[PDB]
Amino acid sequence: YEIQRERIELGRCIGEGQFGDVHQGIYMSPENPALAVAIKTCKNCTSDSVREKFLQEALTMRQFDHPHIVKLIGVITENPVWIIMELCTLGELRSFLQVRKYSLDLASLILYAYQLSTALAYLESKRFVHRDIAARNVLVSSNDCVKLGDFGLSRYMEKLPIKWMAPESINFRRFTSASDVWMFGVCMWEILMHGVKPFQGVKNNDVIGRIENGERLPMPPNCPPTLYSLMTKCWAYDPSRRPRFTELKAQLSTILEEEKAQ
Ligand SMILES: COc1cc(Nc2ncc3ccn(-c4ccccn4)c3n2)cc(OC)c1OC
Fold first, then answer.
1. Range 240-246, long-range pairs (CB < 8 A, 24+ positions)
2. Where is the active site?
């Protein structure tokens, strides 16, 4: 997927990544329409080390192709090293949700959860374990199209997302499709909470002991009990008792149609 700077146009910085600033911009191939794209840059990439860690995200994404998973489009492996990928115009799901709280309908909330479950159903069919499913890792493409990102797992380098992680992940570093379901459960909770973080105001160490106590994130105000009951299953302490995505995906569809026609 090698590209050439000659066809890329750097625009406004859109945020800082783990390796460098991220700029939005556009890629343009001649008789081909110009397409918006994000350009991840890496300031310390002259260092072989840092580069390997930076480009790894592209190698990973190079294996996927799903409508709800941020797409890789190319990479400029020479220098300065850049990774070019699809542009999600509306930003991160957390902000988008906090800003459109009193403006987004419930059905759109469930629809986002559903679209994410489809992307995850797909990764589970490829036996891929993401490891960090969280609202903060979801980009918004349109009012009715969410996408999953952060395959480079920015939060596991060197920050430990204890409050999103499955117990076995914290306690034993065990990451499996089942732990991804536990996380997706918290992510559903965030979406419904309009981008508020889980267990805010609770010390990690404390969240852990609470889970083992059977306590779980409370039901989001105005959350259909059917949806919360589905989150509660994603949070079964015993990983084997957690549902898989083919099933989450089928129930979210149901629940979505019920919130639609109602
Ligand atoms: C940083 O969140 C944003 C992302 C996007 N677009 C977007 N599209 C593709 C990618 C790929 C990576 N990122 C990204 C952004 C910041 C930090 C790390 N990655 C991406 N972000 C657009 C934004 O402007 C509204 C934006 O600010 C809210």
1. 240/178, 242/178, 242/181, 242/182, 243/181, 244/124, 244/177, 244/178, 244/181, 245/117, 245/120, 245/121, 245/124, 245/177, 245/181, 245/184, 246/121, 246/124
2. 132 (proton acceptor)
Our mutation pick for probing the ligand 1 site, out of 64, 85, 92, 98, counting the most ligand atoms within 8 A of Cβ, is 92
**Look-up: residue for tokens 């191939």?**
29
Query: How many Å lie between the centroid of ligand 1 and the Cα of residue 168?
Result: 31
Nearest to 118 by CA among 212, 257, 247: 247
Fold equal for 1-87 and 88-260 = no
Q: Nearest C-alpha to atom 18 of ligand 1 is from which residue? A: 17
Protein residues with CB under 6 Å of any ligand 1 atom? 14-15, 17, 22, 24, 38, 40, 70, 85, 87-88, 90-92, 95, 139, 149
CATH: 3.90.70.10, 3.30.420.40, 3.40.50.720, 3.30.200.20. Which one for 1-87? 3.30.200.20
CATH class of 88-260: mainly alpha
Domain ranges within the chain, ordered by starting residue: 1-87, 88-260
- Experimental determination approach used: X-ray
The resolution of the experimental structure, rounded to one decimal in Å, is 2.3
Q: Residues 189, 198: contact at Cβ < 8 Å?
A: yes
Question: If you ran DSSP here, which 8-state letter would residue 155 be given?
Answer: G
